[PDB]
Symmetry: C3
Subunit: 450 residues, 3 copies
């Protein structure tokens, strides 16, 4: 149920019909692995099945020593320039710091003695979920101790050698990811947290039923917005913090704004003036205001659900939406940029394509079964994605999205015609309708002086 | 056969001698894996060789269930601001959408019954290559059914346990990549498509012999420009779309433009004016025009072959090349920027290094066996890579490329001297030679008024 | 021992107390793997243990052929616009090129005959460390030749089949990484160089004892700043160059500068003027000057040690530090930007948070156990991280860093009040205090004309 409207007057289009899924907070969980403390590998036997077990214990001990070197380092990692600067893992690292305090590990270790999942209140008072995901201590001590603890080693069966390599592999891969990521990984792989464990962790979290359903049906998105932070390894326990997203805003209207340069079409080369709406990005109603996301990557779309991160957003009054139907409205000052760079390009929207065609550029739209069906004249135009498969601007061939949905072409005079090119400011990168008007007055006043 | 020319007048250099390899389209292929439908693991025997087989089937079924959660989400993912906005996987996703239609899977499944490679015309009419790369259904049903389908399970040999883990591993790794990439991966790994399968897929594609030779000798580049899109999993078939690049433009001349700030060298601190050519990047002749690639990553160089993506390009008239030999030419308006920020830096070209040395900065060029061999005075200068191994600008040490090739130093008066610093605009980021001239006239006219 | 100072006058904060770890050069080492030359797999026996060995040799030969296709391609890969352009792997590639010369491999192969580590002087004269990390030739020829070299193949034990898959796996993973990275990988994984081999390689390098201690305690950072460059594969030897960082500057003072927009707080909407210090980033004393790193990613912090890369830096006079205590100082011209965009945001510093609150925005600071404890008025303010856990600006919730350290609030009149909004330039992106003053004079002079 996605719709789109193109505004010929402002060379821009809005895609409506989306639902919000904004990350507004973080939930920190502590994931543990019970380790076996092995120092000496006591066996002088040259048996082939013992040698393969000795070689896997060396890999095991190498990973332990490798992780111990990571815990000794406190781990870390148009209108985009207007944002702030957050600290993404500031919450998770804070939990990682507490686990270094004395006895804090013993709290975790004792709570995870009978069950593999428990809720622990730390010394500072925060209630974190704790999960023991692997008990290599139990396996090594019950299945491998009678082998490599005496001098007359008992030769294991071939099946145990294979089984130990499987169980040890997860530890090795967790160590591998932390080694090439300085102890902070994102997204969180299935080695840090399996699809079963993650879903189970979501169900046990203190969140609403709407958040549980949302997170469970989009765990791949949950992983891309999660961090895995190596913390400690001591007292036979490896602990790393998993920082999961909290979606405080769900199911509010979202819309995406696409913009393209709007220039004059005079045949004289340098006598053209351009103008581009700069407020392009994702917009989502949020607590009476509008959360605006100017960057491309910060929002991921899954069907009609938009997952965004508020740390890369601005908070604007809802009147910002008035710029779509009336860019000259007196309630909000719509942001634009100006130039004399009349160069051709295209923007692929959710349900169509905007084409800014200028100069000697060949701009067309094609179908697979029939070829060219529309040829654009100079200016800014738009074509729906129904019956159109590709758009061509110069030597560039853009495929359009085949998402189903109705588009609407809103006819209107391109607002660039309302300006006189002799008093038009054309070097404005962070400007607005009013900043241009007041700047034209100053130029127009100095002309009135003559 | 790479050459380079440095232009002292404009503080810029051009590297010629390259050949084009531009991605201009996409080819979509459907890769399938025949799966076995296993529900109940019927065996109450505690045999060690059966237990290892049961543990691998659980991993198998976990990957199947994990993939089923991915298919329920329609998957997605100086002069750089001038480009447009494409939708990279719009073509592949379109094919991924068709595979959800009724019976479309049965078409694929039936065509891949006798052979593992076939050409299928879908319901919409497009002809796509289809490849069955793994038949776990055949392996599980022929090698594993007589084990875990009765209640008196037949204990397999140890060799089958090892063989099943190998064949199941590819499915697990494909699932792993799609889990941490929201169903869209790039580059395409050897798990999605092995070097043998990819080469075979290229040879069977409906393309020219030049494209086949080009793609086969640079498959590592082909992978970096390809996408793997998870599609469907039903009726015992896992299908994912692989989106491969089409190189419509091959073997045309390409050249790379390097630019650096050109400032005045007055000893008074703030009395200096700067000027930098902004049209830097890769240029490739293309269909009578020139494809310009302003960003760094969009083009990858392999020997003398330049692989670029047209979606991140502009289409300029061929006269843009005139800016190199004459920046004041009357046919094309060469783009520049201005500032008063006289700060030192260097640009490592293909066959040398440009040095913009200003103020109290120590700028040198060194050889490993002899140390400093040249000391730069203030201004913009250039040194060939023959006999030079490193360049130093301040506290920064740049190694130069040791690619073989002749360089040419084109003497000329730095054009920054032709301007008077009192009417010089110094806040222009998107400007040109003519925009500066007409702006100097307006400032010069208001001075004539006095 | 980290401290922080906030400057209310300039809406900026400086975090002191850090120690430098600047990458200033590169060390190139050659890592080799002795390969076995296998062509024909002579065995017509259908034994299950032979079949598993034949299947692993095919994977082995596939990786060899895959690597041979990579070596045939010479491999490659606010104030940020002011930097230069280096060539990161120019040093490593230079070594990779020399290994293609005749007999250069024989030098390496002969030197690594008795030991697995040797120092080799190449034909050009450079002394590089060389390390043989895997001898598959020795394993295949001693453990696998009596099997697949006769026609009456001798069936191996099951333990050898498992052992061969382990030793062959490293070669396969090295091949895997080079396939999806065009022969150049970063960071350097434990497959290219294990934690034991890397530490051993560091200890044998011709560097100081301070560099050895620094590199060994932060090998995860060493990996993130290293490259692995596929070179050659011929004469039964696979060789790839590992490019390691050299830290020429260690333990000098470093400090991080945070800045935020400073605007006027008039209730009239568009009558406000803004101003933002643009010199934000990392600063480290370096050889009498100051190395300035304007970008975020180029510096990684581990406790109080800052690892930076000089290739992404500028070299400024030490007087740049005067802008913190006096932005109007006459020795250095402090860089700023101007706008009329009064929009709310926050910057999370090392020990607190700057809040730029304007208009109808709700800006607060909270504690977990008590909720809101401070409400910001319009303007630019600051709050320490002691007793504060989160900051909220609009719909955005920022967690603050809980690093221990003292903060200091330096009271002062916001310098934006000293300007008259009628002659204030508000479109300056690359400007400074003096450029603004001289621009106000020109506007003020034309007003004096009337
Ligand atoms: C569009 O949306 C409404 C509510 O989502 C739904 O009831 C309606 O059926 C949808 N239209 C179509 C054609 O399905
Ligand atoms: C400023 O410009 C606006 C629109 O361009 C106009 O309505 C207004 O009268 C001007 N003001 C002055 C003082 O010229
Ligand atoms: C330079 O190029 C031409 C054509 O590529 C070739 O014939 C010529 O031999 C090359 N020069 C050298 C020195 O090899
Ligand atoms: C504008 O400037 C150009 C070059 O600076 C000059 O040739 C031309 O005569 C000027 N035009 C006017 C009207 O001053
Ligand atoms: C702060 O630093 C100095 C030197 O690093 C150290 O001697 C002092 O003890 C530190 N302060 C505290 C409270 O530890
Ligand atoms: C320029 O401005 C500065 C400060 O704004 C002032 O001290 C100086 O006198 C001015 N110069 C002229 C010529 O007006």
């Amino acid at each position: 149920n996605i719709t789109e409207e193109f505004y010929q007057s402002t060379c821009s289009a809005v895609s409506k019909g989306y639902l919000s899924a904004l990350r507004t907070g973080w939930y920190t969980s502590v994931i543990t692995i019970e380790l076996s403390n092995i120092k000496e590998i006591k066996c002088n036997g040259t048996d082939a099945k013992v040698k393969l077990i000795k070689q896997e214990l060396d890999k095991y001990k190498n990973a332990v020593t490798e992780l111990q070197l990571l815990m000794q380092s406190t781990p870390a990692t148009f209108l985009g320039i207007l944002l702030g600067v957050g600290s993404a893992i500031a919450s998770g690292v804070a939990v990682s710091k507490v686990l270094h305090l004395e006895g804090e590990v013993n709290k975790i270790k004792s709570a995870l003695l009978s069950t593999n999942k428990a809720v622990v209140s730390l010394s500072n008072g925060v209630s974190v979920l704790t999960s023991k995901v692997l008990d290599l201590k139990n396996y090594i001590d019950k299945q491998l101790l009678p082998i490599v603890n005496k001098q007359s080693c008992s030769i294991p069966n071939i099946e145990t050698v294979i089984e130990f390599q499987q169980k040890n592999n997860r530890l090795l891969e967790i160590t591998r990811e932390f080694s090439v990521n300085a102890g902070v990984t994102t997204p969180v792989s299935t080695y840090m947290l399996t699809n079963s464990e993650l879903l189970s962790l979501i169900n046990d979290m203190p969140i609403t039923n709407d958040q549980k359903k949302l997170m469970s049906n989009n765990v791949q998105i949950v992983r891309q917005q999660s961090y895995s932070i190596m913390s400690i390894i001591k007292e036979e326990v490896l602990a790393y913090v998993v920082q999961l997203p909290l979606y405080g805003v769900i199911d509010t209207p979202c819309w995406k704004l696409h913009t393209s340069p709007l220039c004059t079409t005079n045949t004289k080369e340098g006598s053209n003036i351009c103008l581009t709406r700069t407020d392009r990005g994702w917009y989502c109603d949020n607590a009476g205001s509008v959360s605006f996301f100017p960057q491309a990557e910060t929002c991921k779309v899954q069907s009609n659900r938009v997952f965004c991160d508020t740390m890369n957003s601005l908070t604007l009054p809802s009147e910002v939406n008035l710029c779509n139907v009336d860019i000259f409205n007196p309630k909000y000052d719509c942001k634009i940029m100006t130039s004399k760079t009349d160069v051709s390009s295209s923007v692929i929207t959710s349900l169509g394509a905007i084409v800014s065609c200028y100069g000697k550029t060949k701009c067309t739209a094609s179908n697979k079964n029939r070829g060219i069906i529309k040829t654009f004249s100079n200016g800014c135009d738009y074509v729906s994605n129904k019956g159109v498969d590709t758009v061509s601007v110069g030597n560039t061939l853009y495929y359009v999205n085949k998402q189903e949905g109705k588009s609407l072409y809103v006819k209107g005079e391109p607002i660039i015609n309302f300006y006189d090119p002799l008093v038009f400011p054309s070097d404005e990168f962070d400007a607005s309708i009013s900043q241009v008007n007041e700047k034209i007055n100053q130029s127009l006043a100095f002309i009135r002086k003559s």
